[PDB]
Design a protein around this ligand. Sequence first.
Ligand SMILES: CN1NCC(C(=O)N2CCC2)=C1C(=O)NCCc1nc(-c2ccccc2)nn1C
Ligand SMILES: [Mg+2]
Ligand SMILES: [Zn+2]
Length: 312
Amino acid sequence: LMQFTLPVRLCKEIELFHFDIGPFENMWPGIFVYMVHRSCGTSCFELEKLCRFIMSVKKNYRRVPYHNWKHAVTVAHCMYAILQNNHTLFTDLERKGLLIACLCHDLDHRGFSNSYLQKFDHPLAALYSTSTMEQHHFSQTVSILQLEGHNIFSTLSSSEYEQVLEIIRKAIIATDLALYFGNRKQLEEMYQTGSLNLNNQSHRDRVIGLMMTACDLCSVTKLWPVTKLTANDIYAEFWAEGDEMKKLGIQPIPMMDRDKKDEVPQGQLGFYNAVAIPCYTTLTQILPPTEPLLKACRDNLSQWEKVIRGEE
Ligand SMILES: CN1NCC(C(=O)N2CCC2)=C1C(=O)NCCc1nc(-c2ccccc2)nn1C
Ligand SMILES: [Mg+2]
Ligand SMILES: [Zn+2]
């Protein structure tokens, strides 16, 4: 009979797509449990097992500027908002799996791209030739699920358990942005030719994949000061990777070169036009109640255009 309850401002604003989880790290576990209880049920998980899983998940995120515990909870919250605005579209197992997938999707991230691991010749690049970090994040999720007292799915049948772990594997792999372009083109063609079918499992997979991209990129759907300050954390990682590329004797791409800071605003416009806007446009076509994400992304594109015009 033990609910989590949040203060009034958080209780109202957590329901909105643009919610920022705030700088009080100690409230993030409670925020997550709150979201599971409302999006899944107070019966989905044994509270003591869920609490122990969340805290081991936190321990296995590193102290990097962007790909950290705050990012994990932020991406889970965007998924909560999508699930709560599309009540009847998702199965019981999907509601269970997807918040967990989001919390776990960047486990043990080091702040480097798949490219850098391949050029450094990191051991993970030999074990997983494509989607290198994302296969590692899924591997870290299964490890934590198998620690004593951490199996939050213990009440599922053997076949349901296999199905949830397959939802999580696919959802985590889909956060490889290299895979996003092709997934979105197929979804665009399917929706427009009217072949899109939510009883087709391979179609559900693609739609859940696009949801993962949308949640993963959700800093672009926040209030402008959140968007702008999150971008600083993103580039702090990229520029450290650029420095490490120069240490291997390789000129990084400009996105990762701190000498080319001046070009960030134009790089943001390219990213909004080539990745974010098309992501939230297709998502809105498939799931109309996600429209607020697209509207917020377009507002932030317009703020980056003001930056370029020297209006800020
Ligand atoms: C907001 N965001 N969410 C996620 C995300 C992203 O890529 N993730 C991969 C791991 C996180 C971004 C983001 O900002 N990406 C950079 C966009 C960009 N900057 C530049 C650039 C900058 C300066 C000089 C020259 C080029 N080019 N481009 C294309
Ligand atoms: Mg990732
Ligand atoms: Zn991520």
